[PDB]
């Protein structure tokens, strides 16, 4: 058997309020989880995740092949050269089981200065026809802002955890410019499940997605109640329990850089499970020009021998590297 990873449930509700001692006690729990396996469940988060899952299922199950081509990223549709990040990521029956829909900041409109400038990593979202998917765009955009709010509260907890003022990260996480993304991932049930869509780890574990660190500051993840994630610890890969009431939280490699690996970006992977399920990450990205000076909370003077890295530089390089390492999703 594989051991169960220690993934505590942390009541994050004080991070939305004004009780500073209570927020420090949440911050300590974040610190402890970040120094241990690197994962925790945020509970009492205030988001209606059941309705998220229902609306997402309605979308995934009703979108047609025609609509998928019409929304497709450039990796699948050469006509869509502006769609690097945002749009549909098709499955390939017999070969690639997963499919997904990514969207970015709804404030990236045609008139946004970074869209006008054609700055890398910024794109205008694409949406299916309203008549075919009534209410979907509005729901999805509202979800962006709901998860943005949760993420901002979480970032206040991380800041406090690291000995900083509570706006240390949040001041760089702003509605007008955040590079954060939502991905609505569908993992299908298939009978037969094609072997070509199943990867095998060096330890023999069947996988849907190989080991990686996230490209993010933090990742704020809702999943169905089907166990699938594993985290590498000193004791080997351990199973992360599912909890479809909570959000699973981890640090990405930008946090590891800024903290000199004090809060590591945990290495994790996705087991192959032949089940119809959802994986709905929010990748908490800062603005393109956001730079936080790296530090080290283990050193008396806080100094680090890492160089400052703007978030835009980080993100553009990281997304490419993850595609090269683990394949086009
Ligand atoms: C939550 C994950 C483990 S993370 C891992 C995999 C994924 O699809 C993985 N992550 C990525 O591919 C990066 C998506 C970035 C997004 N298009 C953007 O432009 O910002 C997920 C899963 O398979 O459940
Ligand atoms: Fe991941």
Swiss-Prot record:
Record note on what altering residue 281 to L does: Abolishes the catalytic activity
Pathway: Antibiotic biosynthesis; penicillin G biosynthesis; penicillin G from L-alpha-aminoadipate and L-cysteine and L-valine: step 2/3
Main location: cytoplasm
PROSITE patterns in the cross-refs: FE2OG_OXY, IPNS_1, IPNS_2
Cofactor requirements of the protein: Fe(2+)
GO BP terms: penicillin biosynthetic process
Highest taxon of the lineage: Eukaryota
Catalyzed chemical reaction(s): N-[(5S)-5-amino-5-carboxypentanoyl]-L-cysteinyl-D-valine + O2 = isopenicillin N + 2 H2O
EC supergroup of this enzyme: oxidoreductase
Outcome, altering residue 281 to A/I/V: Strongly reduced the catalytic activity
Annotated family: Belongs to the iron/ascorbate-dependent oxidoreductase family.
Oligomer and partners: Monomer.
Name of this chain's protein: Isopenicillin N synthase
Organism: Emericella nidulans (strain FGSC A4 / ATCC 38163 / CBS 112.46 / NRRL 194 / M139) (Aspergillus nidulans)
């Amino acid at each position: 058997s594989v051991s169960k990873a220690n993934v505590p449930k942390i009541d994050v509700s004080p991070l939305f309020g004004d009780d500073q001692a209570a927020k420090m006690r949440v911050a300590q729990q974040i610190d402890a989880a970040s120094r241990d396996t690197g994962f925790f469940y945020a509970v009492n988060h205030g988001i209606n995740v059941q309705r998220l899952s229902q609306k997402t299922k309605e979308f995934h199950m009703s979108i047609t092949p025609e609509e998928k081509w019409d929304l497709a990223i450039r990796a699948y549709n050469k006509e869509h050269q502006d769609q690097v990040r945002a749009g549909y990521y098709l499955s390939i029956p017999g070969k690639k089981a997963v499919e997904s829909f990514c969207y970015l900041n709804p404030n990236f409109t045609p008139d946004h200065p970074r869209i006008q400038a054609k700055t890398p990593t910024h794109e205008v979202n694409v949406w299916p026809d309203e008549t075919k998917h009534p209410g979907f765009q509005d729901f999805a955009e509202q979800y962006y802002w709901d998860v943005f709010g949760l993420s901002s509260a979480l970032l206040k907890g991380y800041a406090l955890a690291l000995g900083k003022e509570e706006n240390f990260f949040a001041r760089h996480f702003k509605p007008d410019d955040t590079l954060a993304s939502v991905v609505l991932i569908r993992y299908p049930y298939l009978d037969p499940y094609p072997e070509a869509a199943i990867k095998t780890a060096a330890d023999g574990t069947k996988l849907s997605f190989e080991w990686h660190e996230d490209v993010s500051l933090i990742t704020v993840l809702y999943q169905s109640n089907v166990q699938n994630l594993q985290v590498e610890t000193a004791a080997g890969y351990q199973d992360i329990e599912a909890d479809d009431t909570g959000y699973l939280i981890n640090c990405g490699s930008y946090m590891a850089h800024l903290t000199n690996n004090y809060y590591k970006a945990p290495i994790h992977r996705v087991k192959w499970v032949n089940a119809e399920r959802q994986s709905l990450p929010f990748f908490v990205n800062l603005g393109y020009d956001s730079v936080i000076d790296p530090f080290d909370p283990r050193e008396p003077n806080g100094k680090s021998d890492r160089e400052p890295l703007s978030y835009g530089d980080y993100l553009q390089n990281g997304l490419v590297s993850l595609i090269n390492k683990n394949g086009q999703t």
